[PDB]
Every structure is written in structure tokens, then in C-alpha cells.
Amino acid sequence: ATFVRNAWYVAALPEELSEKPLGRTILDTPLALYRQPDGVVAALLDICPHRFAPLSDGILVNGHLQCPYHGLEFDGGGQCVHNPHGNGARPASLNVRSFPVVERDALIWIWPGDPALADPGAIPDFGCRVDPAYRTVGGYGHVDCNYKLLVDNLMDLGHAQYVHRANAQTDAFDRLEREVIVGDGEIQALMKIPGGTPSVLMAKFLRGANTPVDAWNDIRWNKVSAMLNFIAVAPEGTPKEQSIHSRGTHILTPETEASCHYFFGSSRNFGIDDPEMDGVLRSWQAQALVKEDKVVVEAIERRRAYVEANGIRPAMLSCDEAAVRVSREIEKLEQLEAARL
Amino acid sequence: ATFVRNAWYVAALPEELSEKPLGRTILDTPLALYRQPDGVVAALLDICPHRFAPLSDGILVNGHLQCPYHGLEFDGGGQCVHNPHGNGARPASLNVRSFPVVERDALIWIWPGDPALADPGAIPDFGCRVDPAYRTVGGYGHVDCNYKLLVDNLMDLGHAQYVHRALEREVIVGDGEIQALMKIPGGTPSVLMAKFLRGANTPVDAWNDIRWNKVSAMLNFIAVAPEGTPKEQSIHSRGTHILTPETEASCHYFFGSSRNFGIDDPEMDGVLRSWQAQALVKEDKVVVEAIERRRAYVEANGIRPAMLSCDEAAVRVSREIEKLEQLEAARL
Amino acid sequence: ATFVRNAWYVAALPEELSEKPLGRTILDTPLALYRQPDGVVAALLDICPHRFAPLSDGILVNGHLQCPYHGLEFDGGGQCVHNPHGNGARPASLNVRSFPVVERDALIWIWPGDPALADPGAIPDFGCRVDPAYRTVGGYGHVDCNYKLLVDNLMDLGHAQYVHRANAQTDAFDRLEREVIVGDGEIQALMKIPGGTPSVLMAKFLRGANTPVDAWNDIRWNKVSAMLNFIAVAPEGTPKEQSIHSRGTHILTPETEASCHYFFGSSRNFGIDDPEMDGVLRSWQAQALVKEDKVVVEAIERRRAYVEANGIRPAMLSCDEAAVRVSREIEKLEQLEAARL
Numbered sequence A, C: 001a002t003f004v005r006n007a008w009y010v011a012a013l014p015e016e017l018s019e020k021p022l023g024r025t026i027l028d029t030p031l032a033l034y035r036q037p038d039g040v041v042a043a044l045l046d047i048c049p050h051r052f053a054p055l056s057d058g059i060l061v062n063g064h065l066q067c068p069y070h071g072l073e074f075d076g077g078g079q080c081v082h083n084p085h086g087n088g089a090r091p092a093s094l095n096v097r098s099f100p101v102v103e104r105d106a107l108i109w110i111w112p113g114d115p116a117l118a119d120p121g122a123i124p125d126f127g128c129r130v131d132p133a134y135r136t137v138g139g140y141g142h143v144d145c146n147y148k149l150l151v152d153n154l155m156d157l158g159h160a161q162y163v164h165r166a167n168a169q170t171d172a173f174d175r176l177e178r179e180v181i182v183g184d185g186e187i188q189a190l191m192k193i194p195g196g197t198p199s200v201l202m203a204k205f206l207r208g209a210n211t212p213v214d215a216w217n218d219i220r221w222n223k224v225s226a227m228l229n230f231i232a233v234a235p236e237g238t239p240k241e242q243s244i245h246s247r248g249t250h251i252l253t254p255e256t257e258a259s260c261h262y263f264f265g266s267s268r269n270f271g272i273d274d275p276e277m278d279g280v281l282r283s284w285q286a287q288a289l290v291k292e293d294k295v296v297v298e299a300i301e302r303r304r305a306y307v308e309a310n311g312i313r314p315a316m317l318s319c320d321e322a323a324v325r326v327s328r329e330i331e332k333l334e335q336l337e338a339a340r341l
Numbered sequence B: 001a002t003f004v005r006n007a008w009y010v011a012a013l014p015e016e017l018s019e020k021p022l023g024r025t026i027l028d029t030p031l032a033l034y035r036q037p038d039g040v041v042a043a044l045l046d047i048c049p050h051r052f053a054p055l056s057d058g059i060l061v062n063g064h065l066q067c068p069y070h071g072l073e074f075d076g077g078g079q080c081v082h083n084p085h086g087n088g089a090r091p092a093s094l095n096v097r098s099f100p101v102v103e104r105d106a107l108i109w110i111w112p113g114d115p116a117l118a119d120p121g122a123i124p125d126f127g128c129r130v131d132p133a134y135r136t137v138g139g140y141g142h143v144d145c146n147y148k149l150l151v152d153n154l155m156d157l158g159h160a161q162y163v164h165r166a167l168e169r170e171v172i173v174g175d176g177e178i179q180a181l182m183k184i185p186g187g188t189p190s191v192l193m194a195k196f197l198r199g200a201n202t203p204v205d206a207w208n209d210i211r212w213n214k215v216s217a218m219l220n221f222i223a224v225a226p227e228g229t230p231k232e233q234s235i236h237s238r239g240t241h242i243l244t245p246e247t248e249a250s251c252h253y254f255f256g257s258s259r260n261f262g263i264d265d266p267e268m269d270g271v272l273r274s275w276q277a278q279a280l281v282k283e284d285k286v287v288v289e290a291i292e293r294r295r296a297y298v299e300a301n302g303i304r305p306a307m308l309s310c311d312e313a314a315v316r317v318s319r320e321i322e323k324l325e326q327l328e329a330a331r332l
Ligand code: FES
Pocket: A048, A049, A050, A051, A052, A053, A067, A068, A069, A070, A071, A072
């Protein structure tokens, strides 16, 4: 498959890991993810060096992952620390590949490429997720589509007007204002819906509304497939700087060429201590992302064979600039690698 | 896959369609089938021109199918009639492919191939389905086998449907049409059929013919009559047995019964609307799907079928389909 | 796929066959297996010569297998003996392929390759299965892995230490002494676990014993994938021969390139008339082979694509000599055949 391996990808949410290993495939690479006794997260190739058994099916012994087949034990670095057979020798050939991993902003980031090049400073900024001023809730979802389809989906938040009709439709959609900002390793799609009636969702954020209001749906894309949106609503002429909002985490990580992992979240500055508001945001993520965006994109993935078999290319609309620019940047990154090594 | 695209195929029964689009694949082509406000059926490629979303998952807006993803709207011709974005321009690139479709004889016919060759006059004749003198009931069925296996099944020397349990032979070959005739004077095993028996009494003649039309549309004739009456004045049923390829290894099966007896009798409708009693008994379904699973082995090896005396009709039909395949493939 | 067709493989256990045909695929070849009225087992290609229907879905008529589609009937030799259509002629083109089959040692052996080379004298010896001095119980299992993975598994009974720890664990495993015997078309791995307490299984063998014991785990491999192990346990310094033992039948037969049939059994010389002793062996078989072993190897099979895509080769340990020798012999046999056609 075609992937951009030299970049950080989210492999899991902190709460998904423990002393019991989690087996998950990232960029066609099977991984064994677990948290060691000292709390440090480890990510090993889920293939024992001996006979290829799944290390993820083993248990921790003295904080070391024990292969369930013949008992070899490994440390977080992939180093074999115990061989219960024969002279118990541990030659270098018994070490397993260990991947660079960094736990930051309540996310487990992994570098699937040359471990020597992993640069922590290149990890996208999702600080809001651990900011005490924000309330964050979210989850995980699996989708049977190429990750680029979801990136396209998120880079044109205008699809909410239809796919999420019941919760996001606005009567001022025809008055939308959009801008695209290209930076270094970052692209932004700004959108503002002026003087309209709050959508059913924004209304909930406002705990009941009717009077006109201004709403924004901006989104920031960072190298490969990590996005953070900005959904905000505020009366008439109230600047978005001081508006209530939700900074949404929308990060995709390729599983196989035709499937991907979707990590989503909401970091809001309103109704912080409201379990009901928590419910509103969780219901939306469940219906919108997992049970609406999934259907559209999975159906699109099923039609790929037909479109490719024939010479069908997509027809872009005025709302596609951002998505197209991001698509082109990912394509360039793919070409570089396919061309580098 | 190998399909004969230049021909009319049944895509659905009238009752299956409404203002709520039906998504169905025909010859590996996904279609969005729906009936417009004026009652006219439309068939569009189920792939939005914008980003390929399934139009069949959308709803009608002002009689126009609205894509569920970003709202583009299309008319029955595939023409984009509304773009809610930006200047709302509608360049030709936003139109979606529309397929020739004709509703006739209580069937929805579609032409999946070269649209320039789509000629309504070439649509097989199933007039009995809408003939007030006949009572028609039927349904739809899905099978996991290549459509040719079911065509072979139906063309097989008068094996009839379970419900039809019971001069001589004659196989007339025409242009895109083949007829397999069978008259059974007096007969031995049994001439009067379980379902027809209730009619008349005195000695009779029996008939079991089937007509095949270009590709995979068949209409059979199951009948019985006393002494030696006219074939057309007999107690009979004309069965609709039409296959439409879905993928190379699966197909749609549209079946029906047009009978001239017990017209206003509901007991008979129920059994004639049964898939296993009228189209394929479970035992036979297990067999064609099992045959499809053995295709790889037979092809990998040089295994060819050994024909028996009962295969003439099936073989002739198979050869005609093969010729049609070659014609199309030859072009490109 | 790559198979060694010129050799005898077990296609079924005697008890699995009757007048009701069994459809099973061996080396990617679908077969119809059944026992005729006179008790003789027949194996026909499960593809009717007429239109390819599954003969295995038919019934016997006058001892002849009747195709469920149009009624052609065949004898054990594959010869069409009845055509109910037209003049009822039976040309040679209506005969179906019949495979060499031999019922011996309570096993149904079939020859899937060149029929002119099938030699009954080449059938592996599993006489213990029909020896009145032994009590035999066993069964069948289907596994989604290449048969070679299970051959590797069995040629290193040491995995029992971890994969079956709850029932096979042993402390003396560290003082293990193993031998490797090579013979004409035969390889044996010897294992001796002297001085120590018996595992949960051995204790049941000795009907709850309370004495340090000497254990024995040997296994014999014969051409391709037929194995017979020797699990024994006896009061310390006791003649290994005169020990309480169970000769285990462990025979694999490839189904497809990534799946296989597993025939297992236990021929014991202790507790012959004990339905409960029968119960301990049956429970172990259910938990250890069909469950535990299955899980490990099916996971390994799923990782084959990754290991092949990359240049990953297995790292052998001191416990792999036997398995490696057997693997090399099978590879040679594969090369020979591929070298001919
Ligand atoms: S496969 Fe892991 S120790 Fe053998």
C-alpha cells in the first residue's frame, strides 16, 4: 500500500492501554501496545523474533512482555531479556523491533518509520485536550475506508449541512463565508455562518436559543492526517475570540489500504461540569462520526473499484479548495517516499 | 467480469420502487432506482459526480434525487439541476450517468451497455403479465451463483417448478430467441399437474414449453387440456423467469406466474408467490451455489462438462450467449 | 498453491464416514468420501462430470453415489453406472475421478497425486491405534493455518510449557535433555524431564500420584505431515519402556494453502476401561489442540503477509533442531515435485 511512514500517528487513546497488551495494526504494521509497571507505554512489532507468534496475546512478567508461545521475554525497548531455553543465551537476533512512542495531550503517538528520525518536536499540537480550562470527552471508531476519504470529509465541514442534517442544518448556509490559509506543514479551512438561527446542536450548546447568532466551523490540518476543528457560536456581533466553543480532535490513522482508525474528541470551554452536556457531545460523536460519516464514506470506498476500473475522476465544487490542497500535500508526501527509498 | 451489456435486463419489479431510492447492482454497475412524482421510473449510476457518494441513500427534493453528502440534485436524466455551493454553477461535469429504462409488462427493464444501441423494440415480450385475462403473482430472489447456471436450470428438459410437479420435443432457434417445445399426449408418469388437476377430468394432453430471449429472460408455458383441444384454449400458466447478473458470481432472479385459471382464488396466490415453490427449491439452490464454488478447480484443471441427452436446449442457449459476449468483446 | 501431491495423507477417521457422503477438501481438491454397503470406503472427486454439482450432497442408491442434480450414479471406481436420461448411454466421459484410498490403522489414507505411484507399503505405521492392548480415543479439528505451522508446533513439544501451562507446566523443564534421531524418511525428537513433580496431566495419568517422576515427550515424524508422539510418566528411576504411556496420533492434512485438517488421537496402555480416563484425554485434546494450539498458529498465519512482505526470517532456538530438520525435508520434497511438472 501507499503510506507516509515518516510522521507521527495516533495509535491509541491512553485509556485503551494497560498491562494487558492491545494488538492493533497501523500502516499495515501489527503492533503490541502496553503500559509498563512504571507507567511508560511501549510499542513493539507484534511478531515474536523466534517463530512470529503474537506478543500481544502474551502477559507481562516482571514488567516484561512474555511471548505466549515459547516464553521469550522483552523489555520496552524490544530487547530480549530472558530466554528460558538451553543455555538461555540471548543473541541480538532475538530482539524485536520497538517503535518510537510519545504520550502527550492524552494521546499515544507512534512513529512507524526510521526510529532514528523520530522528532518529538514534530508532534502536532493538541494542548487543549489537557488544558484544565477545557472539558474533554471522546472515543475511538473503526472504519472500512481509506483514511483519505475521512480527511476529505473533515476538510469540508460543509457536508454537515446534509449528512448531519438533523443536528447541524442552518438556515444561513447560503450566506457562508470561507477562506483557506496555507502555512508550513499546516492548512486551515475557515468558515463562518453569519446571522442565522442556531442549529439544533449549537442551540444545545446555548441551552436553548432562537435569536440570531454567528457560528464558525474552522479546521486545522497538520502533516498527514491529524485535524483539530473549531466549532463556535455567539450572538450577532460577538467576536469568535470570546465565543463559547468546542475544539474537536479528529485524527485518522491508516490500518490497511482500505481501513482506518478514527480518534475523535471534543474540548469545550462551556458547561465544563455538566454530565448532560457531556451526553450531548457523546451522542453527536456516536451519531455523526460513527453512525453517519461512516456510512457515507464506507459506501464510497465500496465504489472505488468501479471508479478506478472506469476513468472516473471527482468533480470539485466551490467548497473543496481546502480538501484539495490537503489531498495534494499528502500525494506529494507519498511520491517522495515511493521515490526516496 | 464477462457480461453481455448490450441487451435489456430486468432491474426490478414495479412494486419494489417508490420515491425512496433502491440501490441495486446490475452487471457490476451500482444503480439508484426510483419513481419520480409523475410516476416515471429513473435509473442513475449510484455514484455522485462530486465525491462518489451513494445517491440511492438520498431523498427526493421537488422530484429530484438529492445526494446525501453535499446536496447536489439531479433529474431523471442525470442532469444536475441544483448546486447549493458558491455561485451555484452547474457545469456539464456535474451530470451523472442515466440509464435507458422502460417499464413494460409489470417489469422494470434497463439497458446497461452502449446507450446508442438501446432500442425499446428489442425488449422481450411478456405481455401476459399485464393481460386482464391472466392473474399474475411473483417475486424476487437473490442467488450466489453465475446467472448462466440458472439459465441452464430453466432450459433443462422440462423440469418445471415444484408447484408444477407432474408431437414430442422441438427446439426452434431464432435470432436472439430460442424455443424449447414439449407436447405430452396422454403421458405416462402423469400429465395433469397437481396444481392444474382440479380442472376438467377426462383424458388430456399436456404441454411444457419455454421461450428464451437474448441473454437471460425466459417465459415458459405449462398446460393441460382434454382430448386434443387447441394449445391456446387449454388450462395454463405462463411463468416469468428472468435472471440479471449482479456480479460474476451472483445474480438477481425475478419470477412470476401468469395463469388463466382460478383467477380470483387467493389460496393459489400464496404458493405461486413462493420462491422455493416457484423458482428454486432450497436443495437446488445449495447445488448451483456449490457449483459456483467449484469453478476455480474446474478452470484450474482442464475440466469441461459432459453433455447428456437432456442438454440440447441449454447448450444452444449457452452458445448464443457466448456469441453475444464475443461480439461485444470483439469491438473494444 | 504448493503441495506435495505424491504421498499418502489422512483424509478422515473411520468413524467420520458412512453411507452419508462427507465432503472434504484435501490439497485444494474437493472429495466425496463414503463407505459402500460392503464396507469399502470410496473417495471420488466432488465434482459431477455432467454439470459439476457436489456428489457429496447426494445419497447412495443400490450402493452407488447418486448426483443430487440430475441423477447420474457412480460406483466406487468413479465409473458412471446409470444415466436416467435419453437412451441412457454411459460414455467414458461420464466417469468421475476416483482416488486411491486405503483404510489401515483406524485411518483413511488417500493418495492425491499421480495414481501410478501410489504404494500401500509406504503408508506410515500407526498400528497402536488398532492394538487390543491399547485404548484409543480421538477426533477431528479444522485450523485456519498452513499445515507446516502445526508440524513445527508438534516437532517442538516444548511449547506445551507455555501454550498449555495450566496443564503441562513442569519445573524440571530447565533440566530438560533432548535428542534428535534421523532416519530414512523419519525424524524423531526425544525429550526427557527427569526428577521432579509431574504436571497436571501426568498426575492424572498416575491417578493422582505423590512421587517425584521422570517424564518423556518423544515424537516421530514421517514423510510430509504424519506424527506419532510418546508421552510417558513413571516413578523416577524406572525403565522408560515399562512406563505408563500414551502414543499420540497427530496427523495434518493440508486443505488449502492457508488451512488444514488436524486428526488427533491417544492410544494409551493404562486405564483402558476407564470412561473417566477417556474423559481426561478428551478434555486435554479439546483444550490443548483444538483451542490453545489453534489460537497461536492461526495468529501466526495472519502475520505471514507482513513477514514475507518484509524480509523477516525466523530466529531458531536450541529447541528447534527437530522442527528445522523436518521443515527442510518437506521443502526438499516440494522442490522435487515442482522440479518435475
Ligand atoms: S514464537 Fe515467541 S518464543 Fe517462540
